[PDB]
């Protein structure tokens with residue numbers, strides 16, 4: 001995996017040694033080259049995981065997340081180079097360096113063979129996101145956004161640190177490949193109960209679980225665009241990745257300890273979708289939609305059937321692309337009206353038709369329109385939960401109803417109706433903005449043609 | 460015929476011929492504890508390094 005870590009680290013002399021007008025072009029170009037190279041991780045096998053070294057491996061779960069991570073960096077560079085156009089040159093290079101350092105921590109978070117190195121990288125990803133939110137954020141409450149970001153993600157991860165070292169002292173190793181073959185059945189006891197909670201609540205915060213989700217509609221709202229993109233596309237998915245690694249060790253105590261968290265996620269996907277139906281803030285609507293879609297991923301990990309894990313990894317990749325595109329659309333209108341109020345500027349198809357087409361595509365992929373991989377993930381999680389309990393189809397279908405409702409209400413409110421009379425700075429769509437929308441949507445549309453690469457280790 | 464000893468003589472350390480045996484254990488010390496075994500053998504390198512969680516050296 002070192003052949004991607006070293007070009008990611010060479011992006012730092014590539015961004016600090018550039019000409020002052022060339023720092024976006026060079027970083028965009030070479031991060032696109034690294035993302036071109038990221039497809040060499042697709043050397044997967046039906047029996048064996050692609051085990052590089054003692055430190056790194058990449059099975060079919062980490063591989064689409066790595067391609068998505070290495071693809072998201074040029075899109076963040078394109079998205080952030082307008083609102084930072086009046087920034088200091090040194091602060092601009094520091095922003096680019098925080099994005100590169102975050103990519104560096106992510107691409108060896110997903111390839112961590114050993115779980116405490118996963119923990120070190122998994123908590124190292126906070127600090128660039130911390131600096132991005134609480135340096136280049138927008139309004140006054142960006143410091144309360146990162147404070148509840150840093151507190152929730154560390155108070156959940158702190159019992160995880162004791163839990164992984166307890167596995168280290170008892171089993172002998174935190175290699176995932178070793179613990180595939182040395183896993184013991186975890187019985188029913190109170191010690192094993194708090195063991196399960198310590199191993200799970202960190203990723204429950206990072207997904208987020210309903211009830212633990214209150215950091216997210218402030219950390220996504222008060223972030224700049226690259227921060228919101230990476231938060232909704234990768235940093236939520238670190239929790240699903242960690243759960244799919246850690247529920248190997250938590251059997252069969254999961255089969256009766258997962259019930260209250262299955263109830264929390266199955267009801268919070270209804271609650272947060274209803275909350276999306278009544279958001280005045282567009283970026284908050286996309287944030288609560290992200291919570292509502294990750295609740296299904298929590299359910300599919302906690303019921304641990306093969307169809308559930310396939311649907312959960314498909315839904316993580318699909319939702320990463322879709323929510324990144326929706327935040328970029330919301331920023332494209334925030335760069336014109338300077339407000340995130342959704343009811344402020346309406347009728348924008350009368351002024352921006354092609355951007356309204358990108359809004360339509362992102363809304364249709366939001367509500368899981370077939371044959372997108374959004375619907376593949378949504379549908380497989382619904383199949384596995386119907387197998388889990390037949391009564392859960394009511395909550396699943398009701399969630400899908402409310403999902404289509406808030407998706408098309410966002411489409412109607414932002415794009416349709418009568419336009420606003422007292423707003424006259426609505427520029428034509430730049431080539432950069434449509435390039436950003438197309439580089440989101442076209443990979444998402446192409447992954448419907450060959451969906452098997454994003455269906456995880458047990459396709 | 461007794462000559463008084465000169466200055467220095469009565470403080471000399473003399474030798475005494477005895478016919479009693481030397482006390483082999485005047486302190487009545489019991490058996491001493493056996494010492495901890497020392498290290499012996501050459502120093503091979505650490506098997507796969509520090510073994511600290513993921514550090515391969």
Ligand SMILES: CCCCCCCCCCCCCCCCCC(=O)OC[C@H](COP(=O)([O-])OC[C@H](O)COP(=O)([O-])OC[C@H](COC(=O)CCCCCCCCCCCCCCCCC)OC(=O)CCCCCCCCCCCCCCCCC)OC(=O)CCCCCCCCCCCCCCCCC
Nearest residue numbers: 353354357360361364365369370371372442445446448449
């Ligand atoms: C690997 C090789 C692959 C080759 C084939 C490519 C495969 C598909 C890739 C994507 C294709 C579409 C991409 C462009 C459309 C988006 C932008 C747009 O609308 O621009 C308008 C513009 C023309 O319009 P305009 O009049 O100038 O302006 C529009 C107005 O602003 C007003 O705007 P508007 O509202 O009138 O227009 C928006 C309209 C809005 O239309 C709708 O809302 C209706 C669509 C939903 C209902 C109908 C479809 C339902 C699903 C069934 C069909 C799929 C399965 C079929 C198979 C059999 C059944 C299973 O969308 C369209 O007209 C697009 C038609 C195609 C829609 C595809 C599905 C999108 C729905 C959401 C996701 C659904 C699930 C995923 C499906 C994936 C299929 C592959 O289009 C272009 O300029 C196109 C540019 C070239 C596109 C190249 C695409 C390939 C890129 C990949 C590169 C790498 C591989 C190389 C391939 C090269 C091929 C040449």
Ligand SMILES: CCCCCCCCCCCCCCCCCC(=O)OC[C@H](COP(=O)([O-])OC[C@H](O)COP(=O)([O-])OC[C@H](COC(=O)CCCCCCCCCCCCCCCCC)OC(=O)CCCCCCCCCCCCCCCCC)OC(=O)CCCCCCCCCCCCCCCCC
Nearest residue numbers: 002005006009010012013053054055056120513514515516
């Ligand atoms: C014939 C006679 C002549 C022969 C010459 C042969 C060589 C020719 C070239 C001469 C130069 C050789 C250089 C060292 C050899 C390569 C070492 C290596 O890649 O180890 C892989 C090492 C383990 O991978 P592997 O596949 O298991 O082992 C492959 C080999 O067997 C590795 O061997 P190993 O398994 O025996 O390694 C032992 C162990 C292997 O490692 C482990 O056991 C895993 C634990 C490693 C530490 C993880 C700490 C995590 C928490 C802290 C994270 C810090 C933030 C990250 C950095 C932020 C930015 C500064 O090493 C360590 O624990 C040392 C600590 C990590 C330092 C690695 C060497 C760095 C040298 C250059 C530093 C330049 C700045 C780079 C950024 C600083 C951080 C790396 O990779 C990592 O740990 C990931 C990080 C990447 C490593 C550094 C890459 C070096 C080249 C950087 C070029 C770009 C610089 C850009 C500008 C500055 C930065 C902005």
